[PDB]
Amino acid sequence: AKMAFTLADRVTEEMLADKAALVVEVVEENYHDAPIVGIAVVNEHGRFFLRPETALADPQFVAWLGDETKKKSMFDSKRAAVALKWKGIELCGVSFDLLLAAYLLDPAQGVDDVAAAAKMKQYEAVRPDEAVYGKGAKRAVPDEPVLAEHLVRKAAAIWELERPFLDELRRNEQDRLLVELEQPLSSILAEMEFAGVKVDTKRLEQMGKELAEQLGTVEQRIYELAGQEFNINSPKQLGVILFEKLQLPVLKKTKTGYSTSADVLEKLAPYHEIVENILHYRQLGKLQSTYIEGLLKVVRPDTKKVHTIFNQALTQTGRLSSTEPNLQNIPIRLEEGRKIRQAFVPSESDWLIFAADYSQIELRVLAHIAEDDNLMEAFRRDLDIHTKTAMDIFQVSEDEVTPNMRRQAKAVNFGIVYGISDYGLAQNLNISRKEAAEFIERYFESFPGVKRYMENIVQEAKQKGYVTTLLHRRRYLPDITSRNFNVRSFAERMAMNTPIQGSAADIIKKAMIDLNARLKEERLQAHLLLQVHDELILEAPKEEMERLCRLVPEVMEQAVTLRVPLKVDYHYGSTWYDAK
DNA sequence: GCGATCAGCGCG
DNA sequence: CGTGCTGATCGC
Ligand SMILES: OC[C@H]1O[C@@](CO)(O[C@H]2O[C@H](CO)[C@@H](O)[C@H](O)[C@H]2O)[C@@H](O)[C@@H]1O
Ligand SMILES: OC[C@H]1O[C@@](CO)(O[C@H]2O[C@H](CO)[C@@H](O)[C@H](O)[C@H]2O)[C@@H](O)[C@@H]1O
Ligand SMILES: [Mg+2]
Numbered sequence: 001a002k003m004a005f006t007l008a009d010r011v012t013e014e015m016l017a018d019k020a021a022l023v024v025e026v027v028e029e030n031y032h033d034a035p036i037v038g039i040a041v042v043n044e045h046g047r048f049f050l051r052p053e054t055a056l057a058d059p060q061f062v063a064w065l066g067d068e069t070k071k072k073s074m075f076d077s078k079r080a081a082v083a084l085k086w087k088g089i090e091l092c093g094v095s096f097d098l099l100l101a102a103y104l105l106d107p108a109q110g111v112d113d114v115a116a117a118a119k120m121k122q123y124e125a126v127r128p129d130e131a132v133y134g135k136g137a138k139r140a141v142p143d144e145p146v147l148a149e150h151l152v153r154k155a156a157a158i159w160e161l162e163r164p165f166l167d168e169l170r171r172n173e174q175d176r177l178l179v180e181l182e183q184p185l186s187s188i189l190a191e192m193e194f195a196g197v198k199v200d201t202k203r204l205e206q207m208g209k210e211l212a213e214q215l216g217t218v219e220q221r222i223y224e225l226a227g228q229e230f231n232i233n234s235p236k237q238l239g240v241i242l243f244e245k246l247q248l249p250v251l252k253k254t255k256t257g258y259s260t261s262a263d264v265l266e267k268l269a270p271y272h273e274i275v276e277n278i279l280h281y282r283q284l285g286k287l288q289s290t291y292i293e294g295l296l297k298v299v300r301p302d303t304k305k306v307h308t309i310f311n312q313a314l315t316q317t318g319r320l321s322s323t324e325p326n327l328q329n330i331p332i333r334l335e336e337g338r339k340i341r342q343a344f345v346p347s348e349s350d351w352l353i354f355a356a357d358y359s360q361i362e363l364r365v366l367a368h369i370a371e372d373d374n375l376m377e378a379f380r381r382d383l384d385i386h387t388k389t390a391m392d393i394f395q396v397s398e399d400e401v402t403p404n405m406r407r408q409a410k411a412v413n414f415g416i417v418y419g420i421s422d423y424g425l426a427q428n429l430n431i432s433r434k435e436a437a438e439f440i441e442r443y444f445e446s447f448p449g450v451k452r453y454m455e456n457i458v459q460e461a462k463q464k465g466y467v468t469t470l471l472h473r474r475r476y477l478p479d480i481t482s483r484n485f486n487v488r489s490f491a492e493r494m495a496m497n498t499p500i501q502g503s504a505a506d507i508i509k510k511a512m513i514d515l516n517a518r519l520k521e522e523r524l525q526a527h528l529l530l531q532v533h534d535e536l537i538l539e540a541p542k543e544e545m546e547r548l549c550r551l552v553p554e555v556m557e558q559a560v561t562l563r564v565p566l567k568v569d570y571h572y573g574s575t576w577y578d579a580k
Numbered sequence: 581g582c583g584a585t586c587a588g589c590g591c592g
Numbered sequence: 593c594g595t596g597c598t599g600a601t602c603g604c
Contacts, residue, residue: 136583233599235587254587256601261588286589289598315594319592326596329591337590362592418593490593497593501592533592 003125005040005047005152007144011058014045021159022072023151024080024091027133027141030324031079032193032307033086037141040151042159049148056089068092073162075099075114075154077183078312081190098158100182101165103313104174108476111313114154121164126153174472181471182312185509188516189310189320192528196305197327198347200575201296207339208292211284218281225274232281235260246272283334291331291340298325305347310531317498318473318505319533328532330576341577346539354526354545355579356552356570357535360385361504362417365470368562369499372449379564386410392446393439412439416450417500419493454496461495469502470560471510507566508534511559518555522547537576545572 008015020043028034039050055061064070065084073096074080081091102109102117111117115128132150133139141147169175223229226245230237239258242248248268252259262279269275299306311321322328330344331337346352358364363385367375378388390401390409408429415425420443426436444451458480461467466476475498479491512531519526526540526548536556540548553568560566573579 231600233588235600237600256586259587282588286598290590290596294597311595317594319594321595323596326591329589329596331590333591414593424593493593501594504592535592 002149003047003153003156005049005148007049007148009051009054011050011055011061014043015041015048015050016060016064016070017043017045018070019043020070020072021155021157021162022074022080023155023158024074024083025147025151026079026083027139030309031083032309034083036080036083036087038144038147038151040148040155042152042155047152047156049152056087062089066090066092071095073098073158075117075158076313078186078190078193081187082194085190085194094183094186095179096158096162096166097178097183097186098161098165099313100186101169101178104178104182104473105165105168105172106474106476107313107316107318114157117165118157118161121161123157123161126150126157172472172474174474177472181506181509181513184513186312188512188528189312192530193307193309195347195527195529196300196303196307197529198303198305198345199295199299200343200345201299201304204292204296204340204343207343208288208296211288211292215281215284215288218277218284222274222277222281225272225277232278233285238278242268242274246274248272248275283336287331287337287340291337295325295340295343308530316475316494318469318502318509320505320531322530327530338577342575344576345574348539348541350542351539352542352545352572352574353529353576353579354538354540354548354552354570354572355535355576356538356556356568357532358504358508358556359567359569361507361534361566362500363413364562364564364566365503365507366417366450366453366500367564369470369503370447370449370453371563372447372453375447375450376564382565382567386413389413389443389446393442408439412443415440416443417497419496420454421489421493457499458492458495461491467495467498469499469506471503471506473502473506475502504534507559508536508556511556512536514559515552515555518551522551524548524551537579548572 020041023040025037026034027037036052039052039055041048071093074094075098077094077097084091098114098117099111102111102120109116109120113129115126118124118126127150132142166175169178219232222232226241230241232238236257238260242260243250243258248271250258251267252264265275265279295306306325308322308325308327311323314321331340364379367379378385386406386409387398387401389412390405391398393409393412394405411429412425415421420440422433422436425439426433429436457467461477461480466474468474477491477495479487480495482488482491508531512528516528524540524544524547526538526544528536528538530537549570553570556568557566571579
């Protein structure tokens with residue numbers, strides 16, 4: 001039967017106890033400047049549902065929300081914190097976030113609502129959000145009676161689940177990871193998302209106009225060389241033009257038809273002039289649809305800022321993800337796409353963009369965890385790691401390392417990090433397995449400590465059932481015991497890769513926490529805007545650059561102490577593009 | 581037609 | 593290797 005609760009018309013004192021499960025419901029997936037549809041509070045005095053117009057206007061309730069001594073347990077407190085920031089209300093005292101707790105216990109569960117986390121502890125007296133709000137075009141906020149009970153049941157679940165979740169985190173030695181890292185980081189991400197990044201829309205629009213011109217020209221050139229018109233963006237129609245009308249060789253096949261990936265086209269380029277044009281068309285087309293039109297779609301017209309949402313509880317490695325827009329994959333590798341960054345500017349006049357990035361943090365982390373003497377010495381000498389790798393695997397002096405040799409050694413360092421494998425490397429360097437295996441073997445011959453680590457971590461994953469990062473993040477790998485070579489191999493590569501990528505994630509997250517504490521102590525106006533896996537982007541008055549040049553790198557380099565140094569490069573400029 | 585897939589490409 | 597976003601596509 002239904003759950004008992006008071007559907008209050010006004011805020012009372014017992015609703016303001018110093019310990020409670022709190023629900024500040026924001027149904028819109030993108031919570032920026034979004035509506036709060038209801039509030040539920042469960043504490044020692046009972047269960048309560050409050051209408052937002054009432055609670056959020058009540059001085060006492062707002063004070064309670066902002067009182068750090070009044071502890072609240074929630075699910076996705078960042079969502080509520082940001083929704084409240086847009087209304088000028090501060091949320092403090094969140095001592096437990098069920099979403100983050102569940103995430104740390106097992107990222108693989110994909111916990112995205114209270115019901116999912118509750119199911120982990122055999123608690124099912126709460127419905128999944130999707131069941132209550134529906135989804136897609138049919139998504140909608142239910143009538144008060146249905147809404148109120150759902151919010152109360154969620155608060156009730158959080159109230160009941162706090163202790164068991166904290167107990168397991170403690171057994172896993174992950175309690176500090178939640179309380180001292182992820183929860184404090186949650187508040188920092190909330191400030192970052194709320195601050196947003198300023199966009200020079202006029203510059204973006206002009207770039208868009210020129211791209212349209214260039215696309216038109218390349219588009220026509222393509223129809224000319226094809227002898228007809230067709231939907232270039234249709235892998236099916238394109239496949240017909242390339243492999244049937246033009247008789248280009250089929251080197252790669254796709255489940256549905258002909259593969260037209262850039263990888264394939266690159267090899268087909270020598271056969272026909274249409275290929276290079278299709279490649280150029282896709283490059284510009286990607287820029288136009290995603291980084292110009294797509295970006296312009298999410299810019300707030302009143303402030304000209306984009307407010308991303310950092311998903312802190314999604315990746316299996318501990319990395320953050322970014323959406324609406326995704327600001328972690330803005331072009332940089334190719335100059336034409338890199339120009340897109342000229343569109344991201346400081347939010348205030350006479351302010352500048354400051355970007356700091358870790359130099360090879362993953363390989364440094366690997367040197368530390370594997371305790372490989374050669375790799376540690378390489379970083380202690382701050383050597384060019386790819387040139388050094390080439391020197392060792394190809395057995396030549398530094399001056400004997402050719403450009404192609406370094407390129408291949410670089411690709412090997414790529415593979416060693418993401419889980420070295422014949423297929424992966426071979427196909428990546430466009431070579432054979434017999435050859436790729438030879439490189440790998442040569443690499444392990446030069447870095448025996450890394451080989452030992454790879455063997456040991458795999459064995460450890462099979463024994464314990466999971467692998468861990470420097471700060472105790474965990475990833476379960478049940479497929480590590482699969483009798484299917486492919487499935488088992490993937491699991492083994494994750495056993496190898498996760499402690500590396502995951503520890504690098506732990507480090508930069510701590511750096512963000514340490515950095516914000518330093519910025520505040522120094523009372524600098526500088527603030528974080530974005531995190532891109534191994535780099536931090538800030539904006540600050542031009543008068544703070546010299547101080548940031550010393551502070552940011554130091555804080556990032558000292559976040560943790562490894563057997564090898566951590567090195568941070570940095571640049572600043574009038575736009576993100578110039579922060580190079 | 582709606583949402584779900586597929587195929588291709590951007591980043592670390 | 594992973595997330596995420598795009599235009600096409602197919603599924604019921
Ligand atoms: O609020 C972020 C937080 O919510 C979850 C669901 O619990 O994701 C929702 O919000 C994201 C940001 O708008 C969307 O990308 C996602 O589709 C939506 O379900 C968590 O995954 C996330 O940590
Ligand atoms: O030849 C041993 C070598 O193979 C790997 C896979 O590259 O693991 C295989 O052999 C182990 C026994 O030594 C099994 O536990 C594992 O399941 C199987 O795939 C390496 O880890 C190992 O060094
Ligand atoms: Mg870097």
